[PDB]
Design an enzyme around this catalytic site. Sequence first.
Site, PDB file in Angstrom:
ATOM      1  N   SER A 196      49.954  60.227  37.291  1.00 16.12           N
ATOM      2  CA  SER A 196      50.368  61.507  37.801  1.00 16.12           C
ATOM      3  C   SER A 196      51.077  61.261  39.100  1.00 16.12           C
ATOM      4  O   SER A 196      51.494  62.203  39.774  1.00 16.12           O
ATOM      5  CB  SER A 196      49.174  62.447  38.069  1.00 16.12           C
ATOM      6  OG  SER A 196      48.524  62.774  36.848  1.00 16.12           O
ATOM      7  N   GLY A 197      51.295  59.973  39.441  1.00 17.56           N
ATOM      8  CA  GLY A 197      51.972  59.534  40.629  1.00 17.56           C
ATOM      9  C   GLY A 197      53.247  58.887  40.235  1.00 17.56           C
ATOM     10  O   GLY A 197      54.108  58.618  41.065  1.00 17.56           O
ATOM     11  N   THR A 210      47.783  58.792  39.842  1.00 19.55           N
ATOM     12  CA  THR A 210      47.815  57.369  39.533  1.00 19.55           C
ATOM     13  C   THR A 210      49.251  56.873  39.461  1.00 19.55           C
ATOM     14  O   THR A 210      50.189  57.665  39.474  1.00 19.55           O
ATOM     15  CB  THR A 210      47.099  57.062  38.202  1.00 19.55           C
ATOM     16  OG1 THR A 210      45.712  57.410  38.315  1.00 19.55           O
ATOM     17  CG2 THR A 210      47.227  55.589  37.862  1.00 19.55           C
ATOM     18  N   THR A 211      49.395  55.100  39.348  1.00 19.29           N
ATOM     19  CA  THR A 211      50.744  54.615  39.205  1.00 19.29           C
ATOM     20  C   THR A 211      50.534  53.364  38.402  1.00 19.29           C
ATOM     21  O   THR A 211      49.626  52.589  38.688  1.00 19.29           O
ATOM     22  CB  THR A 211      51.395  54.260  40.550  1.00 19.29           C
ATOM     23  OG1 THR A 211      51.021  55.225  41.538  1.00 19.29           O
ATOM     24  CG2 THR A 211      52.903  54.253  40.412  1.00 19.29           C
TER      25      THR A 211
END
EC number: 3.4.25.1
Lengths: 209, 195, 214, 195, 215, 237, 198, 183, 176, 184
Positions: H125-126, H1-2
Amino acid sequence: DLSASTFSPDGRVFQVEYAMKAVENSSTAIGIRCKDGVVFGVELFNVDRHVGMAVAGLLADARSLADIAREEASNFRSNFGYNIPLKHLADRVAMYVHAYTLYSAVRPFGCSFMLGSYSVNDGAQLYMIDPSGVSYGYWGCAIGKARQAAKTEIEKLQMKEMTCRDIVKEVAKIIYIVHAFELELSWVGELTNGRHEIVPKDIREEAEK
Amino acid sequence: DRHITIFSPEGRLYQVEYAFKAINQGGLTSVAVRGKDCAVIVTHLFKITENIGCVMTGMTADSRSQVQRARYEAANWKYKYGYEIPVDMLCKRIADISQVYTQNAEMRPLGCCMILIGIDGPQVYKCDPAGYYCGFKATAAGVKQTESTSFLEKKQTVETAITCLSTVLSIDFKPSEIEVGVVTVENPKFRILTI
Amino acid sequence: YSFSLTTFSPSGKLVQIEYALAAVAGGAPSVGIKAANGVVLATEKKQKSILYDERSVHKVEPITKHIGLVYSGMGPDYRVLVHRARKLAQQYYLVYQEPIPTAQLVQRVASVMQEYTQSGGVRPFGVSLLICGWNEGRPYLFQSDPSGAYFAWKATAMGKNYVNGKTFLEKRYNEDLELEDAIHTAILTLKESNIEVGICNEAGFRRLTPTEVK
Amino acid sequence: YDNDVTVWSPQGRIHQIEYAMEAVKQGSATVGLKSKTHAVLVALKKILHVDNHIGISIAGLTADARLLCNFMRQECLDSRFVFDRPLPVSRLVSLIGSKTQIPTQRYGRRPYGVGLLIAGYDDMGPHIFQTCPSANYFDCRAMSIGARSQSARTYLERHEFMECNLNELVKHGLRALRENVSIGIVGKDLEFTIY
Amino acid sequence: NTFSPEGRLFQVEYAIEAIKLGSTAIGIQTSEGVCLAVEKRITSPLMEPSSIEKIVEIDAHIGCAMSGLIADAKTLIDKARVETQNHWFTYNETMTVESVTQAVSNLALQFGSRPFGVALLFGGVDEKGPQLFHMDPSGTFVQCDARAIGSASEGAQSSLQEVYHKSMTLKEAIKSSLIILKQVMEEKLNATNIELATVQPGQNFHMFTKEELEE
Amino acid sequence: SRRYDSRTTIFSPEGRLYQVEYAMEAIGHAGTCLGILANDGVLLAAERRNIHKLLDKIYKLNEDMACSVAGITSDANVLTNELRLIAQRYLLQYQEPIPCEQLVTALCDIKQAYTQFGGKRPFGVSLLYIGWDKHYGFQLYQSDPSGNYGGWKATCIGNNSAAAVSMLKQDYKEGEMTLKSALALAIKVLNKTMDVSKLSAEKVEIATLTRENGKTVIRVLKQKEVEQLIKKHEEEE
Amino acid sequence: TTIAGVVYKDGIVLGADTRATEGMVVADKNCSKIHFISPNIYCCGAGTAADTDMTTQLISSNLELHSLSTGRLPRVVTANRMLKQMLFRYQGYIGAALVLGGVDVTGPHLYSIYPHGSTDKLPYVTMGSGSLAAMAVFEDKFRPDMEEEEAKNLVSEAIAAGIFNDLGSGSNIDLCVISKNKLDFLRPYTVPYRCEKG
Amino acid sequence: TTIMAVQFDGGVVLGADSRTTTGSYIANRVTDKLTPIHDRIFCCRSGSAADTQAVADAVTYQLGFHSIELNEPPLVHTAASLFKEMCYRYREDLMAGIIIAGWGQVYSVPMGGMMVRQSFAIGGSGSSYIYGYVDATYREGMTKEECLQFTANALALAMERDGSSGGVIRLAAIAESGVERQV
Amino acid sequence: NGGAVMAMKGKNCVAIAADRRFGIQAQMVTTDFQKIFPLYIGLAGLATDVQTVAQRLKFRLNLYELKEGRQIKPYTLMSMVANLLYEKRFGPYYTEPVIAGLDPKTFKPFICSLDDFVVSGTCQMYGMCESLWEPNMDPDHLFETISQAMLNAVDRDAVSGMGVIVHIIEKDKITT
Amino acid sequence: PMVTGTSVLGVKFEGGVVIAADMLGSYGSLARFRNISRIMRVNNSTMLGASGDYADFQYLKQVLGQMVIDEELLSPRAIHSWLTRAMYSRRSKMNPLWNTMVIGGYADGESFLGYVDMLGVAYEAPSLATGYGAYLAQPLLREVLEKQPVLSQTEARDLVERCMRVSYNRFQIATVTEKGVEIE
């Protein structure tokens, strides 16, 4: 009529009024909303560091409402962070005051108490809570024995542009005219920075003078 | 007898009508008008939901308990369903819990008439401490409530309400005395008119 | 409380329930007839102030796919009683998966009204209500009352002047009559003592459509 | 008719609390005075060890005195354990007001009709605190409770006791009591003890 | 629950009146030994002469006479035994009479449903030697020297007032109860018209056999 | 609060509970009913409360046991519900049909609890139990509206129970009845109790409990048979 | 176990396959999955059939109680919100997931709802064992501006993509149209020795 | 994710991507992660979508019930404090990487649950790939316009490496008198 | 443990059949163990659950059957056990009920199972019966197909067999 | 345990208590919050720093503030004492806090410096250093103590100013002073 749940035919519950009479006996508290701050005076409780309270009506019961108000301020600080606003605090404590009126078993409160708080956004706020759970904002409040009798002199005052600095003496003065008198005074205004605190002893001695 | 909610030999709850008489002795005189496009209320204005308001009328203390219960249920609606509770549904639910006061002899009727206003078109519900609710078209509740109802029956919306309070309480007002709340088709946001 | 407000009179009469029957005597008249196409229930309601609404709170509230209620008595009490009646019906549908038999919903709801004639701190329900239903091959017309006693009927009446309304229903009507024809006796028995109406047939429970009530 | 704890008098206050005051009077007298060196309980044999530096003197019915006292001991241990210091006296007296509070506010629950004199040694200088049958308690320079205390109070307007130390205090405490002597002394030099 | 306008509670004072229809009981304390004594309280002749009981053990060192409402007593008695054994289990010392009586006083007026009518006389010889704690139903225990509880007890109180002795001998103190019980009773006391129980400084509590009582 | 409470569990200075006496009198308002044991089966006649035209009491506790409910209707349903539950719980774990005497003791425990404690009104409804428990054969029990129960060979309950049961005292001879004699005596007493000389089919209904070919069966009489008994009555007159 | 939905111009064509497998054996070659929550709203289920059936019955009784009460046919978002909560609260003990579609005056909504409680309305959704294979066809072929009848030609092929390519999913396609215009159930919709007696 | 939150001017400018993948298989590319929990206060999320549906909405419930009584827009840190409470009490039955903003006051909540006021933050996690681009650009003296290009370009670089984020870059602009949400 | 539960519907006659054995592990206990409890039901799976569900169901069913003398509909019975077993979805009882029997007075068969023919149990059956099923059989035939399917699936199967019971429900007769 | 700061030091100055701590709240190898201030200022003087999962610091910062705010309107030793009760109570349910905190407070001429371990172990110590200095800073603290048995205003000051150079150099240097409650 004698039990709280019952209504007297005319339109009220007489128990609540009998509980109201208790504060009509006890001597006058007088807070005064002012250009900044509310000088409580009572011929005091740190409800919060933010909030002061001046009780009237039988003292025994009054302390429990003080402690509940301290609890209420703390739960608000924890759940929300920010120091409780008085316009919400009055309404919460007043709600708790109201619950008793509604059920036969617990008795209505005897007390009526003016909590007040200076805060930045709100400015000074001076709310008095009746044992019915009717809270209103004020510009001045005075409850007790000399109930309208104090009100004529706080009417004589015109705080709207009186400073807190005149009022710290004036509360004691109104107390002296309606009144030997033990004196208590409080300052909550921006000089005190919203720290509920008793008047400094030299000014308090001067105030009685 | 006339103290614990039970039926009289006439099949009539005494405590309930005592609560109506307590509403009349609350001394306030609320009126609301349902225009086509707007829903005036006038008197204690409340904002039960951002789209819903109501005016309690009666015992002052008593109003706040049902205000908070109305906000509790109104918020809980959106929590389980996800759209504004209709004015009908809100009045229905608050009426359903006011009956609990009546069914139970332990606890007592809260004397506050509850005139809801809000658009589900515009709605003007009444609620009684009885647990009875109905949509009126132009309600009034309070002291001179009957004297107003005639003038409502005889019958710009804001004018209807304000001239009704003026004529019926037989007093010319100051603006501070008449608190007024409007909910226009385009303004489903509960809003005090502010004459 | 924990103590019931129902206690026997010296000869064994439930005084508060008898007073609840007095509350049934109030309330606008209701009427209901089992005809043979389907039952009809109807009730007087009034403009009263001329500022009212008529679609707001029908006394005729559907309960289940083909049951309905009409009350006489106190209106406030009805609003909650209906709620529990719907509770029993939907609960029955998730357990048993058929819309609950008319006789059974009447029985279960009767038990709810019986509980308060034995239960602490509560008065008995003032509302008496016709509960009209049609399952299988039969139209069902029921009367539940304040003590939780209930009876199936072929024709029955409630509210103000039920006393004469039932009399008309046994002489002006008998046997069977095509559904609007048995509505003839409704509209003319109700006349003895605005109006809402709702019918059953086998067409999903139904409110007699307003243009056709006229 | 105010024979219930909940009920308020049309005339005034709850009568059970007032009757609880008279419950105090059948118990024997006890006198509390103090100096900066030592607190002085004197009791006409009633003194109890609430804490290593606090002791109460009962007057009235013994039962409520033990009930309050069994609580006092546990509460003294609460501050001594949780925060690692002696319990300050004033806080424990504030707990007495809180525990005595419940019967007055509720039904079917009678008030703690014992009047207590909670003398203690304290870091603000020793204090004594009468607790009345209502929650209310009083900071005071000197005080007396129980039978015939009014004569004992009369002696004290003319009374020197904040100056003269524990021997002379007690010599005069006995003189006050004349208006069978248990003595309860605590001070900065010594732990509460039943002389 | 209602504090009378004259201060003191109602039900308690009525419970005190319930004691007056309870058996007379002397609670002798000799400084040698304990001598709890109680009129048999038998009235009916085919009611058993040896199965009726008035005085119960609590520990091996504490006896417990009872008066007032005999049925009610046994609840507080059983709970007293549970308390003493609980003390033994936690501290291995036996529970002294002052605290055995105190624990029972704590339960006395816990009605938030009705007060007990019982007067109790714990007698237990504990390291202090003889101790005799009377217990009022007002939730008040008091240390005693000679207190006689029950109905003709007021006359037994005043009789005791002349004869009470500094110190006292065990057997002589026993004889005092044997004489006073004839006065307080309506009938002429017989060994089947008393149930005596005694605790010598060294012994564990003993219900007294009848033959010894005639002497 | 509790100041209202009339107690309704109290014990009276005459030494007989109030609600129990009132419960006995509630039944007198209740309509006539009677059950009659025989050596092969047990009858239960009952009178339908009014004959009213436009209206279109005995219940199935089991298939081997059944009850008559007299004192009131609203309470009776809850009693019957609890009876069906007790019986079918007993059938659940012991896996045999409840013996009828037991089923009566269970409901009477439930009834007694209402008098003994809780400040709640007692069920005012006298019941009969017709049944055929495994261990005794046919049996009939009557439940007073306070706990009691009495195995009875014939009994009546409802309006004029006293005249009716007293009529059966001498008119029910002991240990002689074929079921035919049970029908005859039933129809007699129910006939004599009402001011109507004979009774209509909208008055009597008779649940005969008969050991049907090794599987005991309760059956309400089919009305055509109800009218042959009534039609026989017209000539018994 | 290929269930699907598409939001076409007038509403939602739900689609389903008639198979339920107990592992490697087909126990039901005519399994009903496009459960009627309400006449207005329908919910396909996938994952464990037991959880899906029973949870759908719970929401059915719930939705039909709320509409029975207001007298106004319930909204789709309501159905979804109580589904969001219902599938959240168990935290994966309800491991059966649902594709709810319905129309309310507010118009069409079709939320795939994952069994941990994520509700996401989208023009096309698929679920079941066949979902990957089905969603590639729904991606490649779905176009916004699609008409009413072409959706029948868009879910029958998409579900067919799950019928052939997958081994958990097979059998006759079910296709259930949702529009305020008309409702349609097409229960079995698209089809893509004697033991001698005596 | 971001999740990529930036503060300033009239109010926050912040953004998030569009994908809500379950494993390697994408489920959706249209998901709005920047979703409202008040008019002022709009939540952003990482951790799981499923735990964040249960949270956030419950914070909206409480927060919009915060607002009616006090009749003021709820304090951003109040909402953030509700996220600290909800996350704090179940940190073990929960996963949530919120980034709560409001009006601008960028606030964050680590899954463990400590509300720690960031001035710019990134979640997922991005997120990690962004660090070298944010730290070397955030500067005092940058006008309101800059943050738009900054956040919008930051996320894209993040997405290039991250195989959990892609979709359309969606930006909130929350500020006095407006929420300009571009995509 | 387990046991097999044959069930089959051809013409108004409703076949159902079951093995009469259960095993403590791999050792047979009894050659007679009831699985088909009388609109009939045949449960197989654990014996504890077979007996538990049979008891609990007859209880719930009898409360209804006394409350209305109206005989239960097969569909409602299916819902009855469906709800009864789903209550343990956290602690689910292991037994597979397969009801079989007529819809009242319309003489219409309704067979179903719960987590043409529905087979369930420890078994062998679903592949065996499926192409042998004839949509029309007189009971005389129906007995024959179900007896073949029963015997052939179960003789092969290790943990079932050793006795067969066959009820072919009909109003006219119920053969065993 | 989630994101964790470390490196809290404490040690007294005669009439004061320096307490320095860096401001990192790393989560894993990544230093996610290179902004956290871990030195709460409790009372006009006394103060806690915390080195352990930061969520627990937030909990105990708001809770210790609850105890102080309550009592104020009704000493470091007392705060440590209770703090041991809090750390202990959470251990008893096996739901600990991962925080390990030094409580430096000048009380009546005495510089109490409590240390409360996460698993509730507790003692006063004059030169406390929590983790990563509980093997590194600690000899540097002692080496001064091995030679001179007490530390002056200037001694402990410079000791910590160097020892913190011996995380990232961004540390705040809180300093109780005869008054109390400073931060640099």
